[PDB]
């Protein structure tokens, strides 16, 4: 959509050069072997590697020199939004399933409210491993009809 790749972005190169020039301005103030100078020299390399990696991944830059993210579902940009999205969904489902399974276990007690303050660690440690298979567990429970009260 009028976007150019990072590796061929003159404004991207200008941003990198300007940041490096600004960083090197403070390097001249200290002795070359001093600890502040050693710490500063490690910052320039980090900037260089970051810019190289951004160029190497085929990110798209506009007229500003800043990368843009395409989330329409293009197969060449699945790492921007699609790939991290499924990971977040899996992790959030794990957390939710563990939290839901803990409450059901203690609901049958005489005083279920007491277990919400003093957490039963031996009981909680067993349920934690069970969240690994939460997609299959939820898929099977939905079909059987036990998901909704």
């Amino acid at each position: 959509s009028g976007l150019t790749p990072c590796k061929d972005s003159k404004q991207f190169a200008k941003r990198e050069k300007q940041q490096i020039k600004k960083l090197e301005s403070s390097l001249k103030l200290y002795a070359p072997e001093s600890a502040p100078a050693l710490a500063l020299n490690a910052q320039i390399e980090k900037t260089k590697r970051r810019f190289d990696n951004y160029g190497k991944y085929g990110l798209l830059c506009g007229s500003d020199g800043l990368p843009h993210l395409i989330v329409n579902g293009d197969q060449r940009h699945w790492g921007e939004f699609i790939t991290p999205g499924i990971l977040f969904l899996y992790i959030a489902g794990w957390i939710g399933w563990v939290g839901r399974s803990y409450l059901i276990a203690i609901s049958g007690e005489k005083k279920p409210a007491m277990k919400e303050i003093i957490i039963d660690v031996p009981l909680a440690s067993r349920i934690i491993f069970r969240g690994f298979i939460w997609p299959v567990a939820a898929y099977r429970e939905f079909l059987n009809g036990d998901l909704i009260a």
Partner: protein
Amino acid sequence: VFSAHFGQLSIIFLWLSGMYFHGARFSNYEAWLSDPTHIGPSAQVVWPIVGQEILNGDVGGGFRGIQI
């Protein structure tokens, strides 16, 4: 009330100990002592984790940190 006052005194002493220690290890006190007017006092230093080390300014005396 007596015991609570004792606890508060303990906390204050711990705070003073921290303040006195930080100026001995992470400060430019000596360089400032050699030139009080042109050097900015500093006693805090930041770890370089998420790029936050930009807060280590050039306070003078061959030292980088936060000006107190």
